[PDB]
Amino acid sequence: MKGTPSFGKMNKTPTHVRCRRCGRNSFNARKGYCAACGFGRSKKIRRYSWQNKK
Amino acid sequence: KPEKENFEMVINFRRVIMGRKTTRTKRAIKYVRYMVKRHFGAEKVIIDPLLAKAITMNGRDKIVRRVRIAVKRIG
Amino acid sequence: MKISNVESKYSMKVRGQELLIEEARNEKGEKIIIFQSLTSAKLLNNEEWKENTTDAKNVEKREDLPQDVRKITGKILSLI
Amino acid sequence: PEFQLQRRLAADIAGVGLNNIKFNPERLEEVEEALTREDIKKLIKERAVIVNPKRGISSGRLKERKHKRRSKGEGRKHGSRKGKSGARTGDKEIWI
Amino acid sequence: RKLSSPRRGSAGLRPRKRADEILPTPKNWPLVNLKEPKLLGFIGYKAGMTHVYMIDDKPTSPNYGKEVYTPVTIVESPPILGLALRAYHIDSKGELSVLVDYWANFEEGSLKYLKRKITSLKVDSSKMKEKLDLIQKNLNNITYMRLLVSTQPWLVPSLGKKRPEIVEIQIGGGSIQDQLNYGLSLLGKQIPVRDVFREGQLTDIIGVTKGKGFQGVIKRYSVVEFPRWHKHRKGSRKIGARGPSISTPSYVPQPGQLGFHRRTEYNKRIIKIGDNVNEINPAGGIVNYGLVKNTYLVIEGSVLGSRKRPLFLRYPIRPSWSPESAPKITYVNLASQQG
RNA sequence: GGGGUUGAUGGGGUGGGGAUGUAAGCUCCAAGGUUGUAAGACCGAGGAGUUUAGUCCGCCACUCCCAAUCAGGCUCCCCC
RNA sequence: GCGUCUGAGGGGUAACCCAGGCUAGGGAACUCGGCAAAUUAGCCCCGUAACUUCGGGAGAAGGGGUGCCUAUCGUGGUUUAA
RNA sequence: GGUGCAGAUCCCGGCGGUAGUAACAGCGAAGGGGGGUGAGAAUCCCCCUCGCCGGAAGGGCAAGGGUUUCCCGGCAACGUUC
RNA sequence: AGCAAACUAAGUACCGUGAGGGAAAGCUGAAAAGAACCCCGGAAGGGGGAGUGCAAAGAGCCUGAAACCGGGUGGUUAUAC
Question: Which region ranges are annotated with the description Disordered (chain E)?
Answer without folding.
Answer: 1-19
